[PDB]
């Protein structure tokens, strides 16, 4: 069954379906799966799924040229929390991993790992069950009152990460970037949205510091430009993205209800221009729309309209992938993909839609997807996502 309310279109026509180098992948269509954390990770170990995982990502390789960014991935143990979310640290982690990649390049597709770093994000109880801190930008300022109360009855209380800190957490970024070019990852993207750590750091919310690290525009992003530097200088700009969240309220950032929102990001993108311009130019950068400002609302819900990505364009002039409830309007995308070097992300209904490219060439219905398996360990809801030829069969 398919979303019944769904009136789809052809989008064959339009750019969406033609070619463009990003970094060094010669990409055939421009529809990108973004990070999507499906939580099939393997505890102890936080192992990439040895029963699942490959074919998962194997089965939405299968439009050749796809652009695949996988699911958010942990530097080092200190950087997750999160049980069932893989690492890409250890050996155990790095041998299934290039068993992924090899099955989403013998697809003639991509793969990049996406660097994620959990901040206040983590279960503190989880991070202090393995001795580990619990890290935000500031101590005073919490996530919420379920985590405060989660660290606070696990005598885990935040942490505010010291200078010294911060350089070991660049240090885990470039090591993580590293495993993950040698393991046969076509590049890396910085996580810096979604209010995870990094995001933290930038949102004036968040972060309380009174250090070169908070207090001002520069010094937020401060942080998020020295993982960028560090990882670009070891594996190379071409092989580097970073993701940026700017109007997202989840986690607990400003998004739109800041006024200097918007300055704070353009300040990253104008330090993204300027180092292109010095030779350096990212591969891509990813933004998140305001149409999702929270991807566990439903689609249209939380969707800030006060705001555009547009100023990106001005200012950051190399390829721009856009995710963001693109999947059940084609009417937008046909006309954001005008512009040569728009990109456009699916996120939730890949899940669905193994076969995606596909149903978005030839304007074909689209899986409904299930909720529910989003965040289980279970091969349903992962990889017994029809292709239109099966759903039909069925
Ligand atoms: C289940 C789920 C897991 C996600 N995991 C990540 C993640 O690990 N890293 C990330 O940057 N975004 C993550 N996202 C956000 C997506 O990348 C995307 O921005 C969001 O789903 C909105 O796109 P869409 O409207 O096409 O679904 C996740 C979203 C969902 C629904």
Request: net charge negative.
């Amino acid at each position: 069954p398919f979303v019944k309310d769904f009136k789809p279109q052809a989008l064959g026509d339009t750019n969406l379906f033609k070619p463009i180098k990003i970094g060094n992948n010669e990409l055939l269509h421009r529809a990108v799966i973004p990070p999507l954390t499906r939580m099939r990770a393997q505890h102890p170990g936080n192992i990439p799924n040895r029963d699942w995982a490959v074919e998962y990502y194997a089965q939405r390789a299968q439009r050749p040229g796809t652009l695949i960014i996988t699911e958010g991935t942990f530097p080092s143990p200190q950087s997750g929390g999160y049980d069932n979310a893989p690492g890409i640290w250890s050996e155990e982690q790095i041998k299934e991993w290039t068993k992924i990649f090899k099955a989403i390049h013998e697809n003639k597709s991509f793969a990049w790992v996406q660097l994620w770093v959990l901040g206040w994000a983590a279960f503190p109880d989880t991070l202090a069950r393995d001795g580990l801190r619990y890290d935000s930008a500031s101590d005073n300022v919490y996530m919420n009152a379920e985590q405060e109360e989660k660290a606070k009855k696990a005598n885990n209380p935040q942490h505010s990460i010291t200078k010294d800190e911060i350089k070991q957490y660049v240090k885990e970024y470039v090591q993580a970037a590293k495993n993950s070019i040698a393991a046969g990852a076509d590049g890396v993207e910085i996580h810096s949205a979604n209010g995870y750590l990094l995001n933290q750091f930038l949102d004036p919310h968040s972060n309380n510091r009174t250090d070169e690290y908070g207090g001002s525009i520069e010094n937020r992003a401060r942080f998020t430009l020295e993982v960028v530097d560090a990882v670009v200088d070891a594996i190379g700009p071409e092989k580097v993205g970073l993701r940026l969240s700017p109007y997202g309220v989840f986690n607990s950032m400003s998004g739109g209800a800041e006024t200097g929102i918007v300055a704070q990001y353009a300040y990253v993108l104008g330090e993204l221009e300027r180092r292109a311009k010095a030779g350096k130019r990212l591969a891509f950068v990813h933004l998140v729309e305001p149409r999702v400002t929270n991807p566990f609302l439903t689609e249209g819900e939380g969707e800030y309209n006060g705001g555009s990505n547009k100023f990106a364009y001005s200012i950051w002039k190399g390829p721009i992938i856009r995710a963001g409830n693109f999947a059940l309007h084609p009417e937008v995308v046909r006309e954001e993909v005008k512009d040569p070097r728009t990109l456009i992300g699916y996120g939730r209904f890949f899940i669905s839609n193994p076969d995606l490219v596909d149903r978005l060439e030839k304007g074909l219905p689209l899986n409904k997807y299930d909720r529910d398996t989003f965040y289980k360990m279970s091969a349903e809801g992962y990889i017994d996502y029809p292709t239109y030829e099966e759903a039909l069969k069925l």
